[PDB]
Amino acid sequence: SYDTVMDKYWLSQYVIARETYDWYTLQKDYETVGMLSSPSEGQSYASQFQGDKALDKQYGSNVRTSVTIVSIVPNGKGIGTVRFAKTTKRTNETGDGETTHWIATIGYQYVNPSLMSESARLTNPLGFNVTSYRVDPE
Numbered sequence: 001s002y003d004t005v006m007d008k009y010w011l012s013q014y015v016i017a018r019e020t021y022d023w024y025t026l027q028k029d030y031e032t033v034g035m036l037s038s039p040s041e042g043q044s045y046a047s048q049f050q051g052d053k054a055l056d057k058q059y060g061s062n063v064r065t066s067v068t069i070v071s072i073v074p075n076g077k078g079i080g081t082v083r084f085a086k087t088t089k090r091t092n093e094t095g096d097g098e099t100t101h102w103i104a105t106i107g108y109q110y111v112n113p114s115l116m117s118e119s120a121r122l123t124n125p126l127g128f129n130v131t132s133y134r135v136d137p138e
Contacts, residue, residue: 003076004074006126007074007080007108008072008074008080010036010108010126010128011072011074011080011082011106011108012069012072012082013032013036014032014033014036014106014108014128014130015067015069015082015084015104015106016067016069017029017032017033017036018033018045018133019065019067019084019086019102019104019135020065020066020067021055021059021063021064021065021088022064022065022066023056023059023060023061023064024061026056030046030049032123033045034046035120035123035124036124036128036129036130037129037130037133038129038130038131040131041130041131041132041133044133045133061091062090062091062092063088063089063090063091064088064089064091065086065087065088065089066086066087066089067084067085067086067087068084068085068087069082069083069084070083070084070085070101071083078107078108078109079105079106079107079108080105080106080108081103081104081105081106082103082104082106083101083102083103083104083138084101084102084103084104085099085100085101085102086099086100086101086102087099088100100137101137101138102135102136102137102138103135103136103137103138104133104134104135105132105133105134105135105136106130106132106133107130107131107132107133108128108129108130108131109129109131110126110127110128110129111127111129112127113125113126113127115127
């Protein structure tokens, strides 16, 4: 399925943007999630970078969390399931970090792309749009 392959691409892009923590990549990841999410899901994502305990304020460049996509099942019923690993490393230090495994359940749709600017279509050509997101331990 062309649709299946394309859904997998965007679900993958979304999880990577949303679960990665990299100081030098943060603004771009943040905007990618923002652009690919509904207002409600976007504000909910953003809450982690708000306030005193905002993640960037706490970590700076001393922590990096990298994502590895393990498997993806879209279901054609507007929900996709993404299994992935997170590896967190304290950048100044050595070793390999902790790796943990998760399952993201993602509600998503595609919105008419004609209703966006050509510029916005350069980052989201198909109107991919995440309406709900949850992450649960394996």
